């Protein structure tokens, strides 16, 4: 459900960041732009900066600099059929979700009901209760987290 | 015989004109103006009381200019060009700058 | 550089704009998330990239899209390059 690779990550720096705090700025930018974001169906759960290989030249574009930082990336992903468990969350009568460490499960409307919040899919689940689900369909992630239409196991 | 022509062309690559030095100075000046760290020797609190163009010229002359230029499939620093041409163009540029009250 | 900056929009009018590499639409921002509506409707996950162009360019391309022409942009992903020391060259004559 995960793998590891060696690759370059592209990043952009401003001139005022080309000071003695260069490594700190590089690391902060890399984390900000790749830490927990889902891109092309995969997420980079852990990023290591080599610190032991030659840094390539930076490209000057308009008033900014572009750098290819070498790194070792630990990619993680999910597919259909995976069984996950997470805390239930209800914000309204139509939006019911399950929050995990790095995964969000969305429940279809024609699966249960919301009343008070509480969920009734054949059993009573309280707002914040922990429930098990199985991913069914994929979508685009939001706020650094996987999104999947899933049904309660 | 292709090797001979290749060597002649590689040597030809090292000549320097106004366009290239003007571009290098432009890049360095823009980056310095927008707030990068000067790379002169003996950097200290006194370095900030000079003229930025003096700083750029000093960096060029002492071989610490960070700009790298690509010309004919190669990558050259400002010190890989012929030295006499660099001096020639810099003399002209500094004269005209002095006329403008920049240097 | 002089003409490049003359023909450009004022640097004080900059803003972040994204484009979908698949169809060329200006990606919308819904609840703070960049999203291409057309490609999302088709169950696709294209790359959104930042561009810096003039407003009139966007107007012209949109109007061309109205007439039925699809305009797609690619971006350069050149591999990294490294500096190598170079031997000295004199170039003066033998006098």
């Amino acid at each position: 459900s995960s793998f590891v690779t060696n690759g370059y990550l592209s990043v952009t720096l401003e001139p005022h960041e080309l000071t003695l705090d260069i490594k700190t700025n590089i690391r902060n930018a890399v984390y900000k732009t790749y830490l927990h974001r889902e891109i092309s169906g995969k997420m980079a759960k852990k990023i290591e900066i080599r610190e032991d290989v030659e840094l390539p030249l930076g490209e000057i574009v308009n008033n900014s600099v572009v750098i290819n930082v070498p790194c070792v990336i630990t990619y993680a992903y999910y597919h259909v059929g995976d069984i996950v468990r997470g805390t239930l969350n209800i914000e309204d009568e139509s939006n019911v979700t399950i929050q995990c460490g790095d995964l969000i499960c969305k429940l279809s409307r024609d699966s249960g009901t919301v009343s008070f919040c509480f969920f009734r899919n054949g059993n009573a689940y309280d707002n914040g209760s922990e429930v098990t689900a199985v991913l069914m369909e994929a979508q685009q992630g939001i706020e650094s987290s996987f999104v999947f239409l899933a049904n309660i196991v | 015989i292709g090797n001979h022509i290749s060597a002649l062309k590689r040597r030809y690559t090292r000549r320097i004109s106004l366009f290239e030095i003007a571009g290098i100075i432009a890049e360095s000046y823009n980056l310095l103006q927008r707030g990068r760290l000067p790379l002169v020797s003996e950097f200290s609190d006194e370095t900030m009381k000079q003229n930025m163009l003096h700083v750029i010229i000093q960096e060029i002359e002492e071989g610490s200019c960070p700009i790298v230029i690509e010309k004919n499939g190669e990558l050259l620093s400002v010190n890989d060009f012929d030295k006499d041409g660099l001096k020639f163009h810099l003399d002209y540029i500094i004269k005209i700058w002095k006329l403008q009250k920049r240097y | 550089n002089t003409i490049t900056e003359v023909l450009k929009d004022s640097e004080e009018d900059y803003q972040d704009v994204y484009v979908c590499e698949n169809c060329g639409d200006i990606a919308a921002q819904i609840k703070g998330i960049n999203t291409c509506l057309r490609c999302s409707k088709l169950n696709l996950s294209p790359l959104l990239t930042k561009i810096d162009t003039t407003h009139v360019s966007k107007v012209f391309l949109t109007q061309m899209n109205a007439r039925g022409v699809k305009v797609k942009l690619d971006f350069e992903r050149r591999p990294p390059s490294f500096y190598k020391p170079l031997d000295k060259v004199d170039l003066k004559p033998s006098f």
């Binding site: 600099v65 | 890049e27 790298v68 | 490049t4």
Partner: peptide, 29 residues
């Protein structure tokens, strides 16, 4: 190039410029 707000391959723009960070990263506070 004018359409997309790029630098023409004329004069100073005939070349491509990089920045060498090697020396800067070899300095320590």
């Amino acid at each position: 190039c004018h359409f997309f707000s790029k630098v023409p391959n004329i004069g100073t723009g005939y070349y491509k410029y990089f920045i060498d960070l090697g020396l800067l990263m070899r300095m320590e506070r």
